[PDB]
Amino acid sequence: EPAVYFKEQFLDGDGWTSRWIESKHKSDFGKFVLSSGKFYGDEEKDKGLQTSQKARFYALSASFEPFSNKGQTLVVQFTVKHEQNIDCGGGYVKLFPNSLDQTDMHGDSEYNIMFGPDICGPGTKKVHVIFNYKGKNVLINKDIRCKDDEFTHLYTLIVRPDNTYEVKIDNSQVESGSLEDDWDFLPGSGDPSIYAYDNFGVLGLDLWQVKSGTIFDNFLITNDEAYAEEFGNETWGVTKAAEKQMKDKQDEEQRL
Amino acid sequence: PAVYFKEQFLDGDGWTSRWIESKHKSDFGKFVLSSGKFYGDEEKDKGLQTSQKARFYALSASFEPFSNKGQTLVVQFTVKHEQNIDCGGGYVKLFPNSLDQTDMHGDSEYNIMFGPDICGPGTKKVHVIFNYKGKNVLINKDIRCKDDEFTHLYTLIVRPDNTYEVKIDNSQVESGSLEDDWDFLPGSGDPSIYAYDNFGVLGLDLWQVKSGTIFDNFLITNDEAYAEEFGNETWGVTKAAEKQMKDKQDEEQRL
Amino acid sequence: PAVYFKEQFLDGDGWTSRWIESKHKSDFGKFVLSSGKFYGDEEKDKGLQTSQKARFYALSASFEPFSNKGQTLVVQFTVKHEQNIDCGGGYVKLFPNSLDQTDMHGDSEYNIMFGPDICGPGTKKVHVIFNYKGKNVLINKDIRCKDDEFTHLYTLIVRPDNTYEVKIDNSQVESGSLEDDWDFLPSIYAYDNFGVLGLDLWQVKSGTIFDNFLITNDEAYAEEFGNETWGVTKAAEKQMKDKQDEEQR
Amino acid sequence: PAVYFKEQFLDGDGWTSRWIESKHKSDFGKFVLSSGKFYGDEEKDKGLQTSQKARFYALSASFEPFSNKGQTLVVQFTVKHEQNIDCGGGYVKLFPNSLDQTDMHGDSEYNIMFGPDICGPGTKKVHVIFNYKGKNVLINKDIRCKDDEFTHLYTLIVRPDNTYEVKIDNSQVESGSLEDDWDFLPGSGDPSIYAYDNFGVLGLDLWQVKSGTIFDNFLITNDEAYAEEFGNETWGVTKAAEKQMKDKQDEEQRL
Amino acid sequence: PAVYFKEQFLDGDGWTSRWIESKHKSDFGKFVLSSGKFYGDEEKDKGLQTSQKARFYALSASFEPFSNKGQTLVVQFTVKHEQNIDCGGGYVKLFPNSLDQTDMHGDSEYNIMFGPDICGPGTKKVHVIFNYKGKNVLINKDIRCKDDEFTHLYTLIVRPDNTYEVKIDNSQVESGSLEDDWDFLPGSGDPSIYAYDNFGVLGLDLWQVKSGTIFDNFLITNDEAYAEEFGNETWGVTKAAEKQMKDKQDEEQRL
Ligand SMILES: [Ca+2]
Ligand SMILES: [Ca+2]
Ligand SMILES: [Ca+2]
Ligand SMILES: [Ca+2]
Ligand SMILES: [Ca+2]
Ligand SMILES: [Cl-]
16 A cells, blocks of 8 residues: 655644744745635635745754655655745755754755755746755756646655656656656766655645745655555546636626 | 576666566566665665566576586575565576577466565575475475575575585575475485576576565576685675665665 | 673563553553563563553663772663564663652663664664763764564673673674764763663564573673573574464465 | 784794894894694794704894873784794783884883783683882782694783783783782772883793794784774684694694 | 952862863863973973874863953964874854853854864964854964963953954064954944953864864963063963073983
């Protein structure tokens, strides 16, 4: 059976406030609030963490029973909804070693992997895939376009023990290849262990936003690609059509 | 001193032309060349590493066939369970030259199987298995294997008087006679039990939950003294620097 | 040789008048007198056995108080993880006589802690902890403990020149000086008062048996007693267990 | 790892340009290059052999001077009393560079003396002597040396926290602190006792009744792990084959 | 005259309760109390000596916090590179009281760094570094440090008009204004550059190849004249006798 290292849907009211921790590294971090926003597919299911303040840094994280991806597939997946029509701001997650002090998390804390959408003005609509290796944060050399509309989108990163990876948006492949080719880690054949991290213990939302209102939901860390795809269809795939219908209706009333 | 087989994986990707993957199944785990996260020497300590969790493995190497009839047979290699293994094999198999390497699997007919096997706190055992009269006969003595994360040397010595010796880290841990330490027959005796007409392949054919085991410094020879020399030139050269590098990493982890 | 404490549990249920259960908590696991499923001698090898899974334990024995000032201190006992332990302690603690035995727990102030600690394939360690200036200072050397199912002898030697030695199965495995092998803030080694030995620890899989406790000031006597206890258990224990393993298969 | 001195006598008669005979006396015994009557390898196991009975010996080798201040000092070499010695030294001395090699003798001022000493039934001892405040201070622990006919590895480790270790055949036999294991001073302590400004010469300066002792594989380094490695590449490679050749000769002698 | 910090190590081992070892790393070198092989006065000239080769060091002393705002700041101490240093620092750092002394290291944020730095033939320099706007700004003037084996006095004077002076052996070697002698800003204008809200710790945080450097007679004060007095009562009292003892030892060495 598939291993589920982390799952968060924010289905149990305020239960999440005991699973996530705010960094105190700075005194003026923005606050996340629980919200399904102005339109949604289901008012309760579509609750997630929403950035609530403009022009702020954010730093909130959740711990889980530590694990290693050594010898295994790693899948990192979540939904992102820039309801506010974002101008400039991140929508990405970071996976940290368990040695991270959650109350001191910030932009320069050492993570293992960073993944997800980053928007800044007309020029930047990009999906980051960053691997930490030999004390450097190495950025993917392929150009992956992210979504930028107001609707909920599913982001999936797959990393395999043969050093292959795949990136999906809305459960459909948008990029793939090998770590040795698509990042500048090192000369020659490569190092067959690049993909692997001794320890994963925390998932962080650690990012900057000008216009706020982004909602993060349906986080999943697993070792099974098929399961990730299922869960994507049970979450994003259930949100999608009703969300779009409610928003069309509101747009019409606005016009009128 | 006859050297029937030697593998140290010193010549880059050269090993990929000396070893053959079985296609008996479609979902065998893959070996990769690696010295892992700590080592005595980054290059010397490269070996074959299991790269996937909860898998069967099946990779082999041929050599000029030989018979141990009338002679001493020595089988030796290093094993390193870097990953702190929960359950998995670390043993080799010696096969007749009639083995189809591309069809090797758990039920292929081997001559001898030798080496460490771990499964939970309860099983930490060295297997010594002889194939005789279509049965795979298991040693009756209980030999404890090593279980830590470091590189260990495993040596099997089989002699034409049907005596055998097992060594770990170049030091004897078990010895006796085939007739006493296995149930081949109800009483004495068949003085030829030790002997095989043909050896042609060495296989790594095994199961692993947590992966990351590294195999290096394989030797098949007819000379005990040479085996001991080679063991000191390989394992014996790895040992102290490996332990020093790992202590350092453990300390940095603690801070 | 001074014998400050000896316990071999040889006199039936006599031990129940020498040891005291902490009531600090209501759900501590219970020790039971047992030689387990295999042994060298069904009677001699009786000792205190942890009887419940996933529990804290807290049982202690008092003795006529003493100080090690100007003397060698030797702490010795046998540990047998019969159950093939996954995670759990096998160490003792030596406490000042000011300890309330009926309130002993994990945070009670001890002088010295010593012995095997196992938690998963990754940790198989011998603790040597000294209490100094209100800190519990952990040895900086890495000492591997035993992890099989058989009875093993653990011995800590502390000398008035601030040297120490650790033995397993009556054979040295570690040695040095207190000043080098711990980060202490000349008599670091010395305590005004020892009055209680406690088994205060955690266990997932239970079944560990503790026997043959000795606190003495004589290294040679400790070694003798080790050979008269562990050394007499060893071979017959292993033989009975090999036999049971064969029948099992 | 710093290698201050290495000598294996592998380059024929090359050694004769690296070692100097004292002329302090006219009747010193002579060293000769030899692997003796039995060996693991006739060439590799060549070393300096005492060639005359009831004699003083005095031969030395210079190296680029160094200080062990702030660092680990490791002194290591092999000794083989092939002749079954009755009485004689097998130890080395490390000297300051101010030593006149041509005048070396029993009373020359050394920094450290280390190694086996045998004299009759009573004495089989490893010396560890430190020169301090114009006295030669003898270790207070009793360390047994080897006395059979085979090659043994002797290793002294001295560390800048004033700890030391002694190994025989790459395995610890003694350890502790300088302040405790020698009478330098009435109490602690002078943390610099371990340290010498200058090492420039290694000497074999000693007495022998029955001659035939072979010295090989000298190493002075600052790295314990490297010393252990080199030990396993030298002693560890001689060991088994040496023993096998000698057993064979013992058997033939008996018949 | 305010004395914010004074250390002469005159009260035996008393210093061990005034200074704290960083535990940021496990392998920092250790300071030991020592007057070395030569000295003016065996007791007075005790100071902190680096005891291990090729190591980072990290030891610090706290004092009642203060600010130099509106006042003169004088930082003074003696340095003796007894070992004839090849490469290594001899400088101090003044830290804010917010520093965790048990975590001090090379990247901890200091206010001011001052003192000699030697690295090979090319570098014999006195550092004067001011932390400003999250940068560590290095003086633009080239100040030669001393490099012989003897004890030298180093003095930094910083004044509330943003002037500074550097002295060696109680005699001026450099002077000027902060705005001219560092690149804080493209042009003149921040008169408070000299000033720090708080000083709470003095650290020895540095690297050394060849070890043996002795630090003594630390003084932090607000009075230039008092610094000069103390310098003459410390360095000035060490100087002549130290030189005389060392000449005597050099002469004995030459014979
Ligand atoms: Ca939700
Ligand atoms: Ca190799
Ligand atoms: Ca008992
Ligand atoms: Ca040689
Ligand atoms: Ca002083
Ligand atoms: Cl009971």
